[PDB]
């Protein structure tokens, strides 16, 4: 099955998921000079005050922090979006070294990592139905650079020893995802896809301009995770990012001048 190796990585995905070569694939390079300021775009509304985290899972490609999405507790609205999108999970993509790891790039700059907060449109009732629709998901992408520690990330870092290998999960209640946001909600937006199989073209991407800073020790703990299951040969979970895909007939819009 698919992964990030020489034999099963992004350039192989098209064989099982032909949409890999589709017209609205993610991620993309954000050319900051070509992105158009769109004064009609609304400020993002991030309403995470009542978020209920439940669990953290090593799924063999990343780790997911899962939320209760059975009510409107943690929602994204406004920005480019029509209606209400419920937070279901967040995860990261990161590198083997600090010079790579993000999926989106900015003028070809690669960040050390990228956080994806995944939300689904409540008009489709469940995540599985939402991924079948062109406006089904809104993913909030946040870049990570290495410098100062991010205090709000440390609870995540400290549980990773308990989910080292594929299929391990741990209770992860009372985590506040507000602690992962930068100060500014200035963003770019474009229509795209899931960045892992099944690569469905169901995402409104919202990529924040302002990165968050994490410490070298925090990202080093990400890199101690394993792709493999328990009692299998150790394969470090690093470089779990898809490279930039062709922009094709798309416009990236900026919320800011
Ligand atoms: Zn992702």
From Swiss-Prot:
GO terms for biological process: angiotensin-activated signaling pathway; carbon dioxide transport; morphogenesis of an epithelium; neuron cellular homeostasis; positive regulation of cellular pH reduction; positive regulation of dipeptide transmembrane transport; positive regulation of synaptic transmission, GABAergic; regulation of chloride transport. It comes from the Eukaryota. SMART domains: Carb_anhydrase. Optimum pH is 6-8. The active site is at 61 (proton donor/acceptor). InterPro entries: CA_dom, CA_dom_sf, Carbonic_anhydrase_a-class, Carbonic_anhydrase_a-class_CS. Residues 1-256 form the Alpha-carbonic anhydrase domain. Substrate binds at residues 195-196. The keyword Cell membrane applies. Zn(2+) binds at residues 91, 93, 116. Changing residue 103 to D: Normal CO(2) hydrase activity. The modification Phosphoserine is found at residues 162, 169. The record marks 4, 59, 64 as: Fine-tunes the proton-transfer properties of H-64. Changing residue 195 to S/V: Reduced activity. Belongs to the alpha-carbonic anhydrase family. Target of drugs used in treatments against glaucoma disorder and breast cancer. Interacts with SLC4A4. Interaction with SLC4A7 regulates SLC4A7 transporter activity. Interacts with SLC26A6 isoform 4 (via C-terminus cytoplasmic domain). This is Carbonic anhydrase 2. The lineage of its organism: Eukaryota, Metazoa, Chordata, Craniata, Vertebrata. The gene is CA2.
């Amino acid at each position: 099955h698919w992964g990030y190796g020489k034999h099963n990585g992004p350039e192989h995905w098209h064989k099982d998921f032909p949409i890999a070569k589709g017209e609205r694939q993610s991620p993309v390079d954000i050319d900051t000079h070509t992105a158009k300021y769109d004064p009609s775009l609304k400020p993002l509304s991030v309403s995470y005050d009542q978020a209920t985290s439940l669990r953290i899972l090593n799924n063999g490609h990343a780790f997911n922090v899962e939320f209760d999405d059975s009510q409107d507790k943690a929602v994204l609205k406004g920005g480019p979006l029509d209606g209400t999108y419920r937070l279901i999970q967040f995860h990261f993509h990161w590198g083997s070294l600090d010079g790579q790891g993000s999926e989106h790039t900015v003028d070809k700059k690669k960040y050390a990592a990228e956080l994806h907060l995944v939300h689904w449109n409540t008009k489709y009732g469940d995540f599985g139905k939402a991924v079948q629709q062109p406006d089904g998901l809104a993913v909030l992408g946040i870049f990570l650079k290495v410098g100062s520690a991010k205090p709000g990330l440390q609870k995540v870092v400290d549980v990773l020893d308990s989910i080292k290998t594929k299929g391990k999960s741990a209770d992860f209640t009372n985590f506040d995802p507000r602690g992962l946001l930068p100060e500014s909600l200035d963003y770019w937006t474009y229509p795209g896809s899931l960045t892992t199989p099944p690569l469905l073209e169901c995402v409104t991407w919202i990529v924040l301009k302002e990165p968050i800073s994490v410490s070298s020790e925090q990202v080093l703990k990400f890199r101690k995770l394993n792709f493999n299951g328990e009692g299998e040969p150790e394969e470090l979970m690093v470089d779990n990012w898809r490279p930039a895909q062709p922009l094709k007939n798309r416009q990236i819009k900026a919320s800011f001048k």
